Amino acid sequence: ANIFCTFDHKLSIADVGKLTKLVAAVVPIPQRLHLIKHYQLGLHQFVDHTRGYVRLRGLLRNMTLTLMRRVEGNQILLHVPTHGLLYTVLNTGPVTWEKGDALCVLPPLFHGPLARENLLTLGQWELVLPWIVPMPLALEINQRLLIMGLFSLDRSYEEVKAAVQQLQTITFRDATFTIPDPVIDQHLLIDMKTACLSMSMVANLASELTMTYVRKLALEDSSMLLVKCQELLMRLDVSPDDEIARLSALFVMLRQLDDLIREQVVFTVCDVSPDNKSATCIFKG
Amino acid sequence: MEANIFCTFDHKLSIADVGKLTKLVAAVVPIPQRLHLIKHYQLGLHQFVDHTRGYVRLRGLLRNMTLTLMRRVEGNQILLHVPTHGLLYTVLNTGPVTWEKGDALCVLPPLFHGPLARENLLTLGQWELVLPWIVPMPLALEINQRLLIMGLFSLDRSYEEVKAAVQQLQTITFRDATFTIPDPVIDQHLLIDMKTACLSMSMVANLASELTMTYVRKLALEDSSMLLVKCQELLMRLPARPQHVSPDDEIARLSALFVMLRQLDDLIREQVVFTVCDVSPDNKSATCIFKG
Amino acid sequence: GPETRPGIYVLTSSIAHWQTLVDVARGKFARERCSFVNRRITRPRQIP
Amino acid sequence: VDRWIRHAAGVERPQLLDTETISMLTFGSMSERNAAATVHGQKAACELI
Amino acid sequence: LSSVLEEFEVRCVAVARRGYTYPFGDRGKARDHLAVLDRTEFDTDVRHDAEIVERALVSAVILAKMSVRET
Amino acid sequence: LSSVLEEFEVRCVAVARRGYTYPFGDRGKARDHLAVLDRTEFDTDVRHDAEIVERALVSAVILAKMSVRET
Amino acid sequence: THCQENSETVALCTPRIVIGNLPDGLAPGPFHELRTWEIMEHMRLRPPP
Secondary structure (H helix, E strand, O other), X not given: OOEEEEOOOOOOHHHHHHHOOOOOOEEEEOOOOOEEXXXXXXXXXXXXXXXXXXXXXXXXXXXXXXXXXXXXXXXXXXXXXXXXXXXXXOOOOOOOOOOOOEEEEEOOOOOOOOOOOOOXXXXXXEOOOOEEEOHHHHHHHHHHHHHHHHHHHHOXXXXXXXXXXXXXXXXXXXXXXXXXXXXXXXXXXXXXXXXXXXXXXXXXXHHHHHHHHHHHHHXXXXXXXXXXXXXXXXXXXXXXHHHHHHHHHHHHHHHHHHHHHOOOOOEEEEEEOHHHOOEEEEOOO | OOOEEEEEOOOOOOHHHHXXXXXXXXXXXXXXXXXXXXXXXXXXXXXXOOOOXXXXXXXXXXXXXXXXXXXXXXXXXXXXXXXXXXXXXEEEOOOOOOOOOOOEEEEEOOOOOOOOOOOOOOEOOOOEOOOOEEEEHHHHHHHHHHHHHHHHHOOOOOHXXXXXXXXXXXXXXXXXXXXXXXXXXXXXXXHHHHHHHHHHHHHHHHHOOHHHHOHHHHHHOOOOXXXXXXXXXXXXXXXXXXXXXXXXXXXXXXXXXXXXXXHHHHOOOOOOOEEEEEEOOOOOEEEEEOOO | OOOOOOOOOOOOOOOOOHHXXXXXXXXXXXXXXXXXXXXXXXXXXXXX | OHHHHHHHHOOOOOOOXXXXXXXXXXXXXXXXXXXXOOOOOOOOOOOOO | XXXXXXXXXXXXXHHHHHHHHOXXXXXXXXXXXXXXXXXOOOOOOHXXXXXXXXXXHHHHHHHHHHHHOOO | OHHHHHHHHHHHHHHXXXXXXXXXXXXXXXXXXXXXXXXXXXXXXXXXXXXHHHHHHHHHHHHHHXXXXXX | OXXXXXXXXXXXXXXXXXXXXXXXXXXXXXXXXHHHHHHHHHOOOOOOO
16 A cells, blocks of 8 residues: 655656655545545645644544655655554654654744745645644643633733743743734634634623523432532523523533543654754654 | 454344345444344344433443444354554444544434334344434434433422424434434432533533633623624623733633643544445445544 | 642553543542642642 | 431441442342352242231 | 521622632631532521521621631 | 722723623723723822822723713 | 715715605606506506596
8 A cells, every 4th residue: 555646747856856855644534545646735725825833733633644764856755654563654844853752743834944945836835744843742731822812802902922931931851932813913823713612602691591500419428529529619690492592502512522522642752863963763653 | 452353143034034134234233242142132222212202321331332334244153343543444324313424423323314214124022223313423312412402400499491402403404314313311420510511511611711701891892793692692691801810821811721632522522433434435334433 | 729739640541531630530539630620729829 | 217217227337338239239239248158059039028 | 597697608608719719728627618518508487597697697607717827 | 098999999880790791892992991991900109009090990981981881 | 875964975875765766767657657557457546436
């Protein structure tokens, strides 16, 4: 089993000399196929000048990852890893690695070239390789971005602008990052506008409805660990069809946000090549 | 561990009795024991048959059963194969639901479609072969949302009020297909799920940031949209907003809340088993990366 | 106590379903599930 | 009155058991604690009006 | 007792909502009295009023000493 | 300073809560004056109070023009 | 329309009320007389002698 690509565009030797440096890469493929166009390669087919982040990962979640192997005349010899076997995956480069790190895929967010970014353009077309990042950096950058979708609604406060100035600088082993602002041109992204409502809606409905369901379980007794919780539910203080539809309006907002939460690992770091030019990893997913 | 399972029959096969099983080749078959030579009495979900007529209890007892793909009808034996983690094998459709490329699949207990094809496809002196459905993930979890909203809805209502929402709740619709769902109503397992559910709803209500819970009201005057008009009706019961708080606290106030967002949604969540790739044109067979 | 002293539990079990393994964990760690509420009753600062 | 019944019968509830222990009852599980010394072997009885 | 007690639960709610805001040396000296502070009700008989308001004196009055660390 | 310092912030909060309710042609320029409208507070210093007030006058007076849409 | 307050060119929206609000070239008057003949026909009514 090997997956092939074809370049209908002519390949200048200067571009294939950068392409040979990609002995391996975590190239997404939307649909597994015996043969596929280069237009299907990368996240560039999903590129949007509007939605930005979140939609890039909600479409990336279904992508079939595949490593690069070898290159021939106007064609790529991609090879799909088997689960559990070791593979010499290339890094996307933002973060230096050390032994034992977890890894997971994230949408690209360039801040100039990354440590491993030889640009390759074939007439308007461009290849945006997905991030391979340690898991704690992914959960933290997701928290910073959802927090950016909260505070961006009211930019004007100097304490808030200093707040965004403080949270913008994530750090790691000799890292010096600066978080991109999703909310370009003042107006909120539609993805930030939806992801924030996905949590804030439950933040209101759970606060209003939590009493009625703990109520019937309060008179019942067992370990009675639940009965005490309502005393702190009271600290921050009637229709039938409204009670019906409202719960259906609850989980529909809760559920798509779970993709923003859970993030299955795809690789794990072991031995590290010098200057982090490559790293062996155990494929997963 | 074992790479394969075998079985033994009592009542003898005929032409149709072996042909219906050859029709089921390369299809999901749960087992509960994983012995090298399981008896047919232990085969299938029929061993969990319940005169009380439950459903969620069949699902929780189904949660621990091992899945094993069918293959090769040598005759007078099932010859099951044990799936390997991380690879792929072809899988026939069983549940009356259309499939699409790349969707997640999960195991769910069967329920009658309505017209009821009632094709047992196998029977003996009483024993039958009830194969659990393989269904797309959003359909697999939305029925859990129906059973859970059915549990919270049951409290403190008249029987006409108890069944008023049920006319919409038990008649789920998906991809033109429609399904009526018999329900346990109260089977303890729904209640213990309700206890961790409301316990999650309490902390999700309580871990929310003072600005995060207010964010809809901060957006309410900011914008005007019909989804926000639908947003607006739920929150209100019958304009000012505040802003404070140091920036650092949000990295904590949000972080632990993510665990509750899992713990609340975990009960409607189900473990994935299949990921379709090469859909068959005839809408029958479907190879799937990853297994149980 | 004010100074947490976390426990460590290696354990073997025939269970292979995480959705049920958390359920059997629900009623066994009743003091611990009570403890997660027991920090909110005293110290809103520092997230449990 | 139910507490007076459990007391007069001598069979006090073990804190209604664990909730998961109740969850295993639908599949069937032992409820009796094993007796200590048992020189006489397995016991059995039944009752009818 | 109508108009008088109607504001009694209101002031008791004010003692509670103000009371959660203030940290103490430990909640174990307060959590029981704080629980009785919000579990207060009013039995239908007037004779049970002696059991009502006096329990609030067992609770909220000590909380004022806990604000001052009185012995 | 009693009633003057007291009711000034109350009317200022009333102009704010009434002010967010009305949509404008852009949230850009208005949001800064809406921020200064809430951030104002009475410092203990006496001579700074005019800057506490006149800076709020830079806000709501422009908002009064935005109530009529002027220049 | 772009109604002009002082130093302004503010947008304005005035909903149509009558069906005859539509400009000619969208609802020309011969079309109104023709629809009026349809009303005199379908509604069963005649002028007095």
